[PDB]
Amino acid sequence: PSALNFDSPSSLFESLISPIKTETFFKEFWEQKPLLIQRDDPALATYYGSLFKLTDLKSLCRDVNVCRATIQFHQPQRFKDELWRIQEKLECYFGSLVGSNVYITPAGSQGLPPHYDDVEVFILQLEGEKHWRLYHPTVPLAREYSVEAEERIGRPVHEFMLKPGDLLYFPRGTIHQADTPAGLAHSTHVTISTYQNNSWGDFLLDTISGLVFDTAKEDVELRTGIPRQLLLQVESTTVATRRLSGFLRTLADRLEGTKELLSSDMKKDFIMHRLPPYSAKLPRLDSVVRLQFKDHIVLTVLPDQEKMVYIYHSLKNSRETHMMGNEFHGLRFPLSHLDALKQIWNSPAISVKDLKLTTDEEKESLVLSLWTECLIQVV
Amino acid sequence: PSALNFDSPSSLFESLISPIKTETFFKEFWEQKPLLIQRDDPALATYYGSLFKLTDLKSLCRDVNVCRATIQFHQPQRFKDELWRIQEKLECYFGSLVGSNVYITPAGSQGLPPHYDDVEVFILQLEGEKHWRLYHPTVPLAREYSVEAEERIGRPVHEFMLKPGDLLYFPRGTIHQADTPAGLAHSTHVTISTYQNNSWGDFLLDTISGLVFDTAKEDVELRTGIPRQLLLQVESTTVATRRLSGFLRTLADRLEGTKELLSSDMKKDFIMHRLPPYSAKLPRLDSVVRLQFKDHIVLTVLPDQEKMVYIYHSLKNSRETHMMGNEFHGLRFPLSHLDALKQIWNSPAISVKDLKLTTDEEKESLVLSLWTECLIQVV
Numbered sequence: 001p002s003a004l005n006f007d008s009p010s011s012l013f014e015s016l017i018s019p020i021k022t023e024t025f026f027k028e029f030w031e032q033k034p035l036l037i038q039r040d041d042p043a044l045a046t047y048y049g050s051l052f053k054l055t056d057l058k059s060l061c062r063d064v065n066v067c068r069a070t071i072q073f074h075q076p077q078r079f080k081d082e083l084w085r086i087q088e089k090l091e092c093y094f095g096s097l098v099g100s101n102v103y104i105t106p107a108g109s110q111g112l113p114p115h116y117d118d119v120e121v122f123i124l125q126l127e128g129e130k131h132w133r134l135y136h137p138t139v140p141l142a143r144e145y146s147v148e149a150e151e152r153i154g155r156p157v158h159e160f161m162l163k164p165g166d167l168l169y170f171p172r173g174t175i176h177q178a179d180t181p182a183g184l185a186h187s188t189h190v191t192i193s194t195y196q197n198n199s200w201g202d203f204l205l206d207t208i209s210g211l212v213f214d215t216a217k218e219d220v221e222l223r224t225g226i227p228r229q230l231l232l233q234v235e236s237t238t239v240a241t242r243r244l245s246g247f248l249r250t251l252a253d254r255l256e257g258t259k260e261l262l263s264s265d266m267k268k269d270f271i272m273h274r275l276p277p278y279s280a281k282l283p284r285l286d287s288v289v290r291l292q293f294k295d296h297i298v299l300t301v302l303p304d305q306e307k308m309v310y311i312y313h314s315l316k317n318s319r320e321t322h323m324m325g326n327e328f329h330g331l332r333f334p335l336s337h338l339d340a341l342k343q344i345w346n347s348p349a350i351s352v353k354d355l356k357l358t359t360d361e362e363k364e365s366l367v368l369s370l371w372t373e374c375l376i377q378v379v
Numbered sequence: 380p381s382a383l384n385f386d387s388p389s390s391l392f393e394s395l396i397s398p399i400k401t402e403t404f405f406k407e408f409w410e411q412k413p414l415l416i417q418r419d420d421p422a423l424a425t426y427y428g429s430l431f432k433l434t435d436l437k438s439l440c441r442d443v444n445v446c447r448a449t450i451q452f453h454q455p456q457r458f459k460d461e462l463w464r465i466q467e468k469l470e471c472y473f474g475s476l477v478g479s480n481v482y483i484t485p486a487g488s489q490g491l492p493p494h495y496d497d498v499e500v501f502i503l504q505l506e507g508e509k510h511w512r513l514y515h516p517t518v519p520l521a522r523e524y525s526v527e528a529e530e531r532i533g534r535p536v537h538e539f540m541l542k543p544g545d546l547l548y549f550p551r552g553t554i555h556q557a558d559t560p561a562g563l564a565h566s567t568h569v570t571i572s573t574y575q576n577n578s579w580g581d582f583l584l585d586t587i588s589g590l591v592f593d594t595a596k597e598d599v600e601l602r603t604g605i606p607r608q609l610l611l612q613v614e615s616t617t618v619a620t621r622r623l624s625g626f627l628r629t630l631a632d633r634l635e636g637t638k639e640l641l642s643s644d645m646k647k648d649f650i651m652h653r654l655p656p657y658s659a660k661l662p663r664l665d666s667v668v669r670l671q672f673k674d675h676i677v678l679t680v681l682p683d684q685e686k687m688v689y690i691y692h693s694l695k696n697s698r699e700t701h702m703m704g705n706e707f708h709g710l711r712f713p714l715s716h717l718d719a720l721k722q723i724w725n726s727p728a729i730s731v732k733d734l735k736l737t738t739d740e741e742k743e744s745l746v747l748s749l750w751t752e753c754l755i756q757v758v
């Protein structure tokens with residue numbers, strides 16, 4: 001029960017934070033307060049120790065980093081399978097990119113100075129022990145990374161010692177600092193982070209375009225031009241703001257009677273950069289098929305590059321470049337197939353004929369396209 | 380009085396639409412209805428005929444185009460000085476890009492089919508005569524260009540014959556079509572268009588980022604994360620919309636007590652692409668200086684590339700590439716100089732000492748920087 005169960009994405013997250021119940025996690029901890037899970041499991045401790053060892057550093061020696069005294073290995077999932085398998089499922093579960101960093105510090109040495117990150121972290125102690133001290137956030141759910149002055153963080157709210165097998169979680173903004181106790185053993189943990197720039201402010205901005213565009217199609221006021229030279233001014237004018245206020249309110253109202261939101265980049269960016277699935281009968285129109293690798297698929301309606309249904313998937317993504325950000329697989333379809341696509345999605349199973357399409361050739365053609373992209377499966 | 384007065388941008392627009400008064404224009408015509416200005420001025424007619432001749436086509440023969448029967452020369456201001464001088468001032472006046480196209484059609488031949496443009500046009504008859512027919516807009520102040528079916532445009536609302544010296548204006552969305560009367564003479568006019576994508580919907584979207592960012596800095600709710608897998612869904616959820624509605628309303632309210640709006644790209648794009656000014660004593664701290672080429676300057680506060688005052692100008696822009704869009708001059712300053720910058724702007728004159736800056740070296744240094752960029756002038 002303490003071992004990681006990779007059956008499903010949700011089954012994995014359950015085991016990762018075991019014995020804490022997921023229901024409890026999201027209810028009292030997630031994006032609220034830190035959660036220390038000290039364990040007593042020799043097996044899990046040994047498992048954890050396999051995720052990344054000091055020696056793994058030499059075997060693989062931008063990849064690493066040194067902070068005066070602390071060695072940081074970036075995105076180990078590009079080489080370590082177990083982690084790739086872990087973070088992959090985490091991405092499916094959270095629906096957000098999930099990267100990780102490894103921190104290695106020698107005995108008796110301090111680590112990075114007091115600071116707070118801009119992501120949700122999941123710390124796993126792999127080797128040795130680390131002295132942690134968490135402080136109250138100066139910026140709850142902070143959006144950017146920052147270091148703070150000791151004269152500002154106040155006094156620790158929670159202090160502890162992590163050892164192999166333990167797991168530490170805390171929301172973005174949580175000020176922290178750690179050091180390796182004097183002695184012989186060095187410390188080694190990996191920090192699995194997610195939910196970066198995945199707030200409502202990001203969602204609002206990632207959907208406001210489609211809203212304005214759809215609304216302006218019926219409100220001539222939005223289609224009206226701006227004052228002359230407005231862009232040449234050095235200071236905004238009350239009218240302009242007053243005007244924009246009404247427009248925001250109009251948008252608001254229209255939204256209530258809305259059921260569609262368009263992702264300008266969020267969806268695309270996620271699928272485009274996420275990890276590929278851990279990978280270490282031909283359909284007829286009489287067949288019964290269903291989506292596979294759903295947690296790796298995404299769809300939206302965008303211009304041709306008129307408006308067509310686009311299917312983006314990450315089955316062909318590179319794990320060697322995950323999160324390194326040093327650089328579009330899918331399918332294009334006419335709106336007429338949208339509903340059909342939505343049927344396939346929700347339906348746990350479905351017959352090719354039941355597709356709400358015009359003719360059987362396209363009824364088949366479609367499922368045949370999806371099949372070549374490894375998205376469809378026959379029963 | 381009918382001749383074009385290039386003293387100032389505003390003096391030019393006045394002469395362009397002469398004898399119509401600008402006050403009348405913006406009050407009853409601009410973005411409202413078409414305005415036909417038939418004239419009787421042999422001088423102006425001859426002037427107009429110089430702006431672009433059939434022969435100018437050969438002298439310069441993506442540049443041209445042929446539509447079955449109609450020849451379209453694109454962006455003539457890249458070679459014709461008078462036009463460059465005209466459109467430049469128009470850009471200063473409108474604060475929006477101002478491009479132009481030339482249409483040449485032989486006698487007795489129809490032109491493009493019925494359609495409506497997505498820009499504010501200013502048609503100038505240069506040679507010959509053209510039979511015009513305007514129809515009611517099917518999409519008032521349309522945002523995109525489109526052709527319409529004769530079975531839809533209804534019956535002409537205004538019909539006329541343009542001849543050298545005349546000027547025709549109509550807002551975007553105004554359906555139209557023209558043909559060259561049978562005979563000997565061909566038609567030649569230039570269409571000066573502006574205000575493309577310069578609506579409130581564009582402004583809202585071009586400023587919403589800075590608003591959310593500034594608001595989220597005090598509203599933790601905006602900083603809160605989105606539901607898991609929200610980006611993996613195929614259909615929005617009432618909650619999400621309801622949520623976004625409140626956020627829009629919050630933004631609205633905050634705006635009322637706001638006095639600052641940030642341009643994400645609008646300003647930058649304008650200066651970056653506009654035309655350069657028509658171009659065919661060293662300052663001391665005791666000097667009295669004032670901005671020159673103001674209508675060609677713009678400022679905003681953006682990340683370093685922390686937040687610094689950026690000055691962008693178009694004095695070094697290429698007229699040969701204007702509006703061809705087949706591809707950043709300015710200065711960087713610390714916020715501490717912003718107010719000083721704003722002083723220089725509003726002030727019709729000002730002494731270097733009066734700059735609200737810390738020390739005299741920077742009081743001078745600043746004005747010296749601006750001076751090398753050709754922005755400052757001494758009295």
Ligand SMILES: O=C(O)CCC(=O)C(=O)O
Pocket residue numbers: 070103105110111112117121123177178179191
């Ligand atoms: O190990 C350390 O010194 C601290 C690492 C850290 O800041 C983190 O895991 O977020």
Ligand SMILES: O=C(O)CCC(=O)C(=O)O
Pocket residue numbers: 449482484489490491496500502556557558570
């Ligand atoms: O000259 C023509 O045939 C029509 C040109 C046109 O559509 C325009 O000037 O907007």
Ligand code: NI
Pocket residue numbers: 115116117
């Ligand atoms: Ni950290």
Ligand code: NI
Pocket residue numbers: 131179180181
């Ligand atoms: Ni310690």
Ligand code: NI
Pocket residue numbers: 494495496
């Ligand atoms: Ni037209």
Ligand code: NI
Pocket residue numbers: 510558559560
């Ligand atoms: Ni005719």
